[PDB]
Design a protein around this ligand. Structure first.
Ligand code: ZN
Ligand code: ZN
Lengths: 89, 100, 1364, 298, 149
């Protein structure tokens, strides 16, 4: 099957939630640029996002990063753009 | 759809297409043939005493029950002698042992 | 954007309609065939809606991009994209408003109940016709009373005011505006309860369930009259020609052009004069026009020139009058799809699939373009649309680079359960057929003869990622129905492993057991190279497992290696060898259940690939080829046949002489042949397991694979017997088999039973989504939304023993269901607080069954949550093995797990067919083993005859040892004598029961005196004489031998005390009055003292039974759809004492004496129904009296709530448990609640008694008023059981019940009530086009992702915030 | 028709490819899996690799022992009845065979009933081969022909194996095949290919007028239907976006098929599903009526 | 059918339910190569601008398309056609709405039969690729016997 699906499943309170995380992670993965795991040993061939989550670095919360005023998820978007060089359309 | 015991040698009880329709069609057997006025009459070799004649006759579905007809799974040397006095024979739905 | 909370439906107000619509359409002016530009000011206008072209104007003054914003001076028009004309709407200001045929033709007249008028009569009289009905004004005192033509009242004055006399739909307005709802509500609550007349309380109690609908949050009734008619979107109804001369246009473009033309002329007949004989002629033509958009056929269908086909109306597109409904849900032709023959993919894993390469060139084209511009294959997107659009070989590489991590969805047409559409990783395979994984073939009920499966392609990445962790096949290894995996090694796979782990045995003399002893190892070590001990025998002596195969290769050893090589290779690719050792044949499915529990999900994935490879690998290394000689014929065959042919001859001779009669000569011939097949069949099963353990045809039937103990008998020995198409068994058995020469006679006989099977699935393959449809549309609103509820109300008691499939079964019903409280029964185990019990827990509740009589367990039928359902009361069922997760459609997964097993069920006739059974009994109960005697529901008592006689029937007589285990099962009749009481020990082979298999003594239960009642000589009693007794005593006459007038008289021996008062039966308040049937034996005097246990009457003969039992598919639809069973059993309206009234061969009676009444409670009992009731103890209310099914409607009114939710879910499983299909109770009760979700309260609290509303809203009202505080209110109610075709017909949602043929009565209800429809279900969420709430749709799943780098980064912005 | 009609008949060589269904005359219907090379597939000790391989497991479940009887009849056909016309007839033609048939026959069949080539001459045998000329490949009636006793006896008369089964060799390994297997020449039959067998490839074709449902015809193939049965499938799973676009961006929704295609060709994902065409059409069919449906926010 | 060498034996997963395994020699020889014939009828009806014509004059095509086609639009007998090649040379008028002011001028100067009709011929279904074995010949007397007959 897929690598460490069980461990992934354990990582989250709700099954359906894990899917949301990976999906959102995949979204950013393309748009902003690329990911946290790379140089030493990452995937091989051409491949995808769960490999990261299996790892410790990512953080998925109900409302991890937002803004003080108004519900703006957007502040996260701005910082990411500033930081990630590769650009999408 | 279900074949009736009377349908013997007049229609193959297992020649219906496989799919949406099962038993709704069922083709017509071999020697069986539509005679004159509907009544399907299957050929029967008229056998007198212990001598089988090569002649054939088409008996009606209602006339068959009036006479006792043997079977084909019976041993026969040629057409003038019979193997065993007592041989399995059929009537019009039942099974009994008749002599030659 | 934001998540859609809920949508609201309500009537459109004139002011609300003019909110979305701009301008006003006056003339029916469409678009010409030449230019697409708007013509005049009709349905197509630039000002009203929008332009057509780019930036050009209608006139042609300014077209250049110079004037993009500023409009023209002569003709100011704002030009924008033609897309604006789509969304933008328009309204048509109609003169005289019309009515909606939905709120009229409907049986529940929305204006007939509210407004006091004929609910059907007056309607079809004032609307279409010219029957004038006064609205209001100061003229005519009659404000409610209607009039006609001659009844038209006029002011007999010199100068009167204008009369507002209108008719049709325009008149209904004022009539609704003149009715005060508040005034009709106050007087409503009074008339019903106060007045004694039942003529008035039954008229207002029906016109209130709609009256209060407008009083609440719902809108006013004054919006049901369509005043403004919204137009149909322009581009939604194009006029582009088809091919040649034929045109393809909507049936609306010919209707809207009619309505408008009949409006502009009406306006002229309003401001001026409005004669009753002029305006009528106007609206008469306009009404017929607007009705075309409503419904055609309810009165007058609109046919086309030389065409008998009513124009497809707007509403006809939903209900499907012409029959398009069977095409709508038939399937929307997916743009990205395909179809081809299927095949098997060995090397192919559960993670991948083998799809054609050419097929990928088409469907996967969109993903190609965005990958071509990266390489040197294509230059631009445009020029690439004319290259990769067809046969190209340059794309083979680039295409495969995209299919790296983008799985697809496979699907078979007959989609039963969830596993109908799984996800797999596409693999470029040559050919045209699609490779389907062998194990997955179990999920799809199909073979490989020509069946074709489709294939889809996930577009967005969001729906692609979730299709690899929740949709992938290897992920969901467990079925939605039960905890048993569907995908599991079947045949060719288990055949390879089975052949491996076997031991051959030939010529052996000396006991060779080297494993253990020390002398044996040396002795049989050199004997191997000798001539005595062979090589293919039982011998084990060496070191490890790896070194063992080395020796077995040099023709030294044979066995003891297959078990070693399989015990190292499998646990090699996956650790944990403690569990990995149980393969076998039946444990092949238990492995995929125990591995997941102990280990995990990922480990199981690779664990399936290992068994697969080695499963088919050694399948060829051994070669289990089947042949003709493989079918070894038992040597005991010719012996049994000879003895059988010699037995039928003797019987025939005994008939010619005079030995036999006509009964023992029939059951003798059929018996010797009914067992001749069983003997020869077992003669081969015990002949190969001792002489040749390695038989192809035998091993392939012994292990898993595909083999039955009935299909092998036919080919091997002899095929037992064949019954006729009807049911009557043939008296002429068949001896010849498949091996030998099968004549034309025996082959013809078997055809009768061969026609049925194939003719069953013939009509199921056409539409297998028929049975499932009746269930899915019912409980589709069940969604998982658990929030630590913990409701301990309406607790469902689980009976220690099920009802009774036959007469006295023994099974348990509890799997993965959380307990209600803390129950202590086992000596070691103990279920604490509500905790999800496992499968091993039910065995405990079944063990100590002699102690517990009811298991406390929370059920789904009784839950606090209204819409959704908590997780506790549910269970573990879902997709894996752990606890149920949040956001799951436990309603569609439960209905699909019932329709699937329905295909294997027998289909004869929906209204029950019939069977054939025999009733027999023996008056001898001899215990086999030792232990004590367990008795349940019995009132033992010693009589004057010195015999421990019982006073109840249907007594559970079983042998319970000291460990509490069922070993025996007997049926103790009424009036039987028990050798020992309850609890007394017994010995092996000892009589513990003995009665008379001829008489059923009518024994009392109380002591006192006997009093002759209703027994006069020559009327009901006459001096007669028995045949066995010899004593002349008073005997009661029969019901047919009685004189005229004694038809109501019923003889009885009423027992009284010393004070003459009545003696009540202990336990209840039932007077002791045992009626004396006809031809009874009364050997007792009058006024003589008696005792509990003394016999009063006797029953000389006994009979009843023969025909009964249903079972099969027909019964399934009979349970969910509560109807009238084939053999209805008259339940007991009152719970009390039971005693037969008559025993005559003609008719048998049964009388019950509650308190005051007695005789009136007479129950007629024919000779067909087998008497299951006794003549002593008190029977429960709703208990079965006859040998047949029961009515879900009647039984509900009697017993209680702890019956219907325990019976309708039990009787259904009694059919699936027979064929082998195991379905959990969880996926059966979730649909039952819906057939009960509606009820009628008796004690009014907020609403009146007769309402028929839901029970979820009534459960909360009684919850907060009682549990909390504020004066507890007893809001008691009565259950109401309906069918799945009616309960779903009238639900909360309007789009859910719109799946039926009654979309007229439903849509009107959710409109006039202004009900807020919170989309909870999923089926009602797919039609609208929203997002599935199950996902991930659940509000619960809002969440963002972070990287450590990103985490420091926002901090930098937070840091900036601090001011200096 | 009108204005002449040109009907061109196309002929395509339909070779044996994965997807074709074949079956004999017993009821054992099956479909070709994968065309495995002559490399892996097993073969006898005298070359002649196996052409078609079936599954013995299709006998226990599917009661059709008859098919196996034909197998033993095909292998031993070189010594039963065909032997009379495959040796006694060929010896009369070729002079280099008459010297081998007369001797190799008696060594195999010593039955007095059979024709003795050693005793009978060229003229005698000739007439003894005309009585069964029609039944070249032996003759077996329907319910009254072969027998468990007659067959076995006819298998010891000619070449080569005994009792039926014979020791083969694995095509992959090459070692001794554990225990003999039943082989021979079974008369199978290929089934015709219906129009439905033709692969149905579709990605972007034409659509209907009144509805936005894709429609096939001559050139563009018809799209597969997604019935309610398939709906409850994805409805069961936790997937939401999968079944959502299934009846939106995929088929009906017009504004969905456009934006989606313009996004995939760029390299990014498709814009979130807005308002499906089904939501629009249905909604408009309500406003025109007496009732009214309007979407509400949070 | 035919007579081949059969050997009943569970190979390796392939022959699971009702599957059949055949050697590669079966495709090397045309022992199961059957003949399939598909009919593709092409009818020309009356257009709003006038009756359609059946000629080889069809714009918006390649050279290899009109190469196999004669001077009447109908392909000869024995053509090695394939997915994309034209089988029937049918044409169909457009309409004033589909006409551009540029092609309207040359329509009344260089003749009517210049830029009035478009491309609407019968091609070969995507996937299948065979050869022509029989062509249909018809020519109505009321429509004049042109170069076709
Ligand atoms: Zn203008
Ligand atoms: Zn609950």
């Amino acid at each position: 099957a897929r690598v460490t699906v069980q461990d992934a499943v354990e990582k989250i309170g709700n099954r359906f939630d894990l899917v949301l995380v990976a999906a959102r992670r995949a979204r950013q993965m393309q748009v902003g640029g690329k990911d946290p795991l790379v140089p030493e040993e990452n995937d091989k061939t051409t491949v995808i996002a769960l490999r990261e989550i299996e790892e410790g670095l990512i953080n998925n919360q109900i409302l991890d990063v937002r803004e003080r005023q108004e519900q703006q998820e957007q502040e996260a978007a701005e910082l990411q753009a500033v930081t990630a060089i590769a650009e999408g359309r | 759809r279900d074949v009736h015991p009377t349908h013997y040698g007049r229609v193959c009880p297992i020649e219906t297409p496989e799919g949406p329709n099962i038993g709704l069609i069922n083709s017509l057997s071999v020697y069986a043939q539509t005679n004159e006025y509907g009544f399907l009459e299957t050929p029967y070799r008229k056998v007198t005493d212990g001598v089988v004649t090569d002649e054939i006759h088409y008996l009606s579905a209602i006339e068959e029950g009036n006479y006792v007809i043997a079977q084909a799974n019976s041993n026969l040397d040629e057409e003038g002698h019979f193997v065993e006095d007592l041989v399995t024979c059929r009537s019009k739905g039942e099974s009994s042992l008749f002599s030659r | 954007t934001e998540e859609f909370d809920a949508i609201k439906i309500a009537l459109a107000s004139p002011d609300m309609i003019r909110s979305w619509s701009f301008g006003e359409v006056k003339k029916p002016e469409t678009i010409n065939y030449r230019t697409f530009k708007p013509e005049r000011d009709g349905l197509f206008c630039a000002r009203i809606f929008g332009p057509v072209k780019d930036y050009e104007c209608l006139c042609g003054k300014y077209k250049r991009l110079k004037h993009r914003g500023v409009i023209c001076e002569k003709c100011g028009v704002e030009v924008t994209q033609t897309k604006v004309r789509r969304e933008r709407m328009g309204h048509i200001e109609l003169a005289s408003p019309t009515a909606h045929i939905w709120f009229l033709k409907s049986l529940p007249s929305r204006i007939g109940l509210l407004l006091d008028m004929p609910l059907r009569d007056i309607e079809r009289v004032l609307y279409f016709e010219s029957y004038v009905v006064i609205e209001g004004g100061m003229t005519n005192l009659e404000r409610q009373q209607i009039l006609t033509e001659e009844q038209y009242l006029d002011a007999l004055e010199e100068f009167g005011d204008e009369f507002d006399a209108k008719m049709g739909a325009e008149a209904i307005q004022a009539l609704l505006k003149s009715m005060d709802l508040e005034q009709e509500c106050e007087q409503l609550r009074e008339e019903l309860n106060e007045t004694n007349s039942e003529t008035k309380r039954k008229k207002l109690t029906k016109r209130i369930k709609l009256l209060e609908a407008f009083v609440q949050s719902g809108n006013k009734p004054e919006w049901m009259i369509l005043t403004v008619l919204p137009v149909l979107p322009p581009d939604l109804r194009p006029l582009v020609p088809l091919d040649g001369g034929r045109f393809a246009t909507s049936d609306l473009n010919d209707l809207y052009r009619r309505v408008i033309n009949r409006n502009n002329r009406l306006k002229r007949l309003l401001d001026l004069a409005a004669p009753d004989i002029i305006v009528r002629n106007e609206k008469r033509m306009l009404q017929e026009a607007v009705d075309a958009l409503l419904d055609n056929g309810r009165r007058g269908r609109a046919i086309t020139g030389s065409n008998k086909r009513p124009l497809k109306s707007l509403a006809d597109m939903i209900k499907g009058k012409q029959g398009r409904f069977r095409q709508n849900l038939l399937g929307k032709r997916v743009d990205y799809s395909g179809r081809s023959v299927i095949t098997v993919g060995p090397y192919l894993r559960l993670h991948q699939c083998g799809l054609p390469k050419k097929m990928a060139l088409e469907l996967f084209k969109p993903f190609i373009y965005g990958k071509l511009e990266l390489r040197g294959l294509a230059t631009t997107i445009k020029a690439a649309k004319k290259m990769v659009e067809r046969e190209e070989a340059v794309v083979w590489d680039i295409l495969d680079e995209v299919i790296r991590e983008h799985p697809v969805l496979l699907n078979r047409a007959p989609t039963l359960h969830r596993l109908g559409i799984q996800a797999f990783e596409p693999v470029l395979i040559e050919g045209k057929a699609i490779q389907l994984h062998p194990l997955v073939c179990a999920a799809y009920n199909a073979d490989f003869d020509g069946d074709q499966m489709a294939v889809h392609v996930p577009l967005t990445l969001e729906a692609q990622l979730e299709a690899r962790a929740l949709m992938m096949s290897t992920n969901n290894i467990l079925s939605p129905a039960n905890g048993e995996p569907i995908i599991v090694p079947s045949q060719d796979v288990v055949l390879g492993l089975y052949y491996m782990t076997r031991d051959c045995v030939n010529a052996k003399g000396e006991g060779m057991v080297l494993t253990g002893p020390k002398e044996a190892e040396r002795l049989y070590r050199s004997g191997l190279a000798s001539l005595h001990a062979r090589v293919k025998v039982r011998i084990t002596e060496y070191e490890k497992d790896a070194n063992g195969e080395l020796v077995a290769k040099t023709s030294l050893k044979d066995t003891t290696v297959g078990r070693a090589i399989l015990w190292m290779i499998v646990p090699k690719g996956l650790p944990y060898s403690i569990v990995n050792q149980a393969l076998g044949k039946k444990a092949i499915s238990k492995m995929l259940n125990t591995c997941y529990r102990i280990l995990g999900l990922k480990p199981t994935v690779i664990f399936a690939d290992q068994i697969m490879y080695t499963g088919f690998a050694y399948a060829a290394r051994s070669g289990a080829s089947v042949g003709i000689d493989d079918m070894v014929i038992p040597e005991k065959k010719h012996e049994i046949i000879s003895e059988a042919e010699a037995e039928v001859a003797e019987i025939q001779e005994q008939f010619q002489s005079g030995l036999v009669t006509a009964g023992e000569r029939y059951n003798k011939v059929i018996d010797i042949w009914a067992a001749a097949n069983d003997r020869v069949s077992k003669a081969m099963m015990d002949n190969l397991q001792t002489e040749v353990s390695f038989n192809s045809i035998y091993m392939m039937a012994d292990s898993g694979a595909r083999g039955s103990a009935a299909q092998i008998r036919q080919l091997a020995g002899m095929r037992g017997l064949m019954a006729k198409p009807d049911g009557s068994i043939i008296e002429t058995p068949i001896t010849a088999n498949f091996r030998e020469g099968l004549n034309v006679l025996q082959y013809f006989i078997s055809t009768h039973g061969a026609r049925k099977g194939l003719a069953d699935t013939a009509l199921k393959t056409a539409n297998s989504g028929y049975l499932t449809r009746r269930l899915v549309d019912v409980a589709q609103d069940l969604v998982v939304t658990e929030d630590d509820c913990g409701t301990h109300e309406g607790i469902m008691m689980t009976p220690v023993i099920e009802g009774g499939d036959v007469k006295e079964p023994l099974r348990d019903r509890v799997l993965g269901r959380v307990t209600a409280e803390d129950v202590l029964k086992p000596g070691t185990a103990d279920i604490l607080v509500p905790r999800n019990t496992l499968l091993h827990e039910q065995w405990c509740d079944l063990l100590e069954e002699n102690s517990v009589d009811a298991v406390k367990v929370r059920s789904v039928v009784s839950c606090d949550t209204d819409f959704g359902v908590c997780a506790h009361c549910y269970g573990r069922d879902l997709a894996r093995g752990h606890i149920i997760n949040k956001g799951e459609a436990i309603g569609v997964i439960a209905a699909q797990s019932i329709g699937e097993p329905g295909t294997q069920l027998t289909m004869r006739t929906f209204h029950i067919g019939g069977a054939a059974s025999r009733a027999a009994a023996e008056s001898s109960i001899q215990v086999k083993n030792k232990g004590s005697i367990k008795l349940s529901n019995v009132k033992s008592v010693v009589n004057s005859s010195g015999k421990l006689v019982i006073t109840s029937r249907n007594t559970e007589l079983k042998l319970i040892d000291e460990f509490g285990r069922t070993k025996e099962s007997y049926k103790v009749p009424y009036g039987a004598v028990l050798a020992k009481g309850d609890g007394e020990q017994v010995a092996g082979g000892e009589t513990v029961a003995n009665w008379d298999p001829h008489t059923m003594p009518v024994i009392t239960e109380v002591s006192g005196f006997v009093r002759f009642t209703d027994m006069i000589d020559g009327q009901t009693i006459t001096r007669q004489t028995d045949e066995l007794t010899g004593l002349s005593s008073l005997v009661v006459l029969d019901s047919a031998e009685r004189t005229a007038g004694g038809k109501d008289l019923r003889p009885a021996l009423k027992i009284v005390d010393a004070q003459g008062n009545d003696v009540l039966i202990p336990g209840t308040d039932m007077p002791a009055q045992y009626f004396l049937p006809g031809k009874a034996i009364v050997q007792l005097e009058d006024g003589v003292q008696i005792s509990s246990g003394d016999t009063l009457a006797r029953i000389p003969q006994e009979s009843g039974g023969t025909k009964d039992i249903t079972g099969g598919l027909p019964r399934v639809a009979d349970l969910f759809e509560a109807r009238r069973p084939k053999e209805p059993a008259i339940l007991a309206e009152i719970s009390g004492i039971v005693s037969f009234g008559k025993e005559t061969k003609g008719k048998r009676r049964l009388v019950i004496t509650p308190v005051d009444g007695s005789d009136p409670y007479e129950e007629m009992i024919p000779k067909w129904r087998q008497l299951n009731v006794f003549e002593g103890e008190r029977v429960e209310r709703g208990d079965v009296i006859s040998d047949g099914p029961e009515a879900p409607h009647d039984i509900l009114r009697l017993r209680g709530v702890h019956a219907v939710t325990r019976y309708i879910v039990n009787e259904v499983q009694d059919v699936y448990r027979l064929q082998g299909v195991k379905i959990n109770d969880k996926h059966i009760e979730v649909i039952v609640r819906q057939m009960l979700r509606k009820a009628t309260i008796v004690n009014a609290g907020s609403s009146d008694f007769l309402e028929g509303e839901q029970v979820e809203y009534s459960r909360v009202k009684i919850a907060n008023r009682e549990l909390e505080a504020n004066g507890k209110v007893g809001a008691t109610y009565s259950r109401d059981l309906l069918g799945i075709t009616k309960a779903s017909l009238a639900t909360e949602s309007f789009i859910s019940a719109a799946s039926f043929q009654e979309t007229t009565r439903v849509l009107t209800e959710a409109a006039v009530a202004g009900k807020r429809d919170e989309l909870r279900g999923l089926k009602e969420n797919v039609i609208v086009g929203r997002l599935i709430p199950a996902g991930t749709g659940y509000a619960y799943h809002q969440d963002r992702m972070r990287r450590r780098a990103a985490g420091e980064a926002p901090a930098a912005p937070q840091v900036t915030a601090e001011d200096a | 028709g009108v204005l002449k009609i040109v009907k061109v008949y196309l002929a395509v060589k339909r070779r044996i490819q994965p997807g074709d269904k074949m079956a004999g005359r017993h009821g054992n219907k099956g479909v070709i899996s994968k065309i495995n090379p002559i490399e892996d597939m097993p073969y006898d000790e005298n070359g002649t690799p196996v052409d078609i391989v079936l599954n013995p497991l299709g006998v226990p479940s599917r009661m059709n022992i008859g098919q196996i009887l034909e197998t033993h009849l095909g292998m031993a056909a070189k010594g039963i009845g065909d032997k009379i016309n495959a040796m006694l007839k060929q010896q009369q033609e070729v002079a280099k065979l008459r010297e081998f048939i007369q001797r190799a026959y008696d060594l195999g069949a010593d039955v007095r009933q059979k024709v003795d080539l050693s005793t009978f001459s060229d003229e005698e045998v000739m007439r003894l081969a005309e009585n069964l000329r029609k039944g070249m490949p032996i003759a077996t009636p329907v319910f009254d022909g072969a027998k468990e006793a007659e067959i076995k006896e006819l298998l010891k008369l000619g070449d080569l194996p005994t009792s039926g089964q014979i020791r083969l060799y694995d095509g992959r390994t090459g070692e001794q095949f554990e225990r003999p297997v039943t082989v021979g020449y079974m008369y199978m039959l290929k089934l015709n290919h219906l129009v439905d067998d033709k692969m149905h490839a579709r990605s972007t074709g034409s659509y209907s007028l009144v509805t936005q449902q894709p429609l096939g015809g001559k050139a563009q193939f018809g799209g597969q239907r997604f019935g309610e049965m398939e709906v409850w499938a994805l409805e069961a799973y936790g997937a939401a976006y999968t079944l959502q676009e299934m009846l939106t961006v995929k088929s009906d929704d017009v504004n969905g098929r456009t934006k989606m295609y313009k996004n995939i060709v760029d390299g990014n994902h498709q814009m979130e599903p807005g308002m499906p065409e089904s939501f629009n059409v249905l909604l408009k069919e309500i406003r025109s009526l007496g009732i009214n449906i309007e979407l509400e926010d949070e | 059918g035919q007579n081949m060498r059969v050997a009943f034996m569970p190979w390796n997963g392939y022959n699971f339910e009702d599957s059949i395994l055949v050697s590669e020699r079966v495709v090397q020889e045309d022992r199961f190569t059957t003949i399939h014939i598909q009919e593709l009828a092409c009818v020309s009806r009356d257009t709003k601008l006038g009756p359609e014509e059946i000629t080889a004059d069809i714009p918006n095509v390649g050279e290899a398309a009109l190469s196999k086609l004669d001077e009447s639009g109908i392909v000869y007998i024995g053509a090695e056609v394939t997915g994309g090649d034209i089988l029937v040379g049918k044409v169909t008028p457009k309409g004033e709405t589909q006409l551009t002011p540029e092609e309207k001028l040359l329509r009344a100067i260089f003749g009517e039969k210049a830029s009035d009709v478009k491309d609407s011929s019968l091609r070969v279904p995507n996937g299948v690729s065979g050869t022509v074995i029989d062509v249909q010949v018809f020519t109505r007397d009321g429509v004049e016997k042109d170069k076709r007959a």
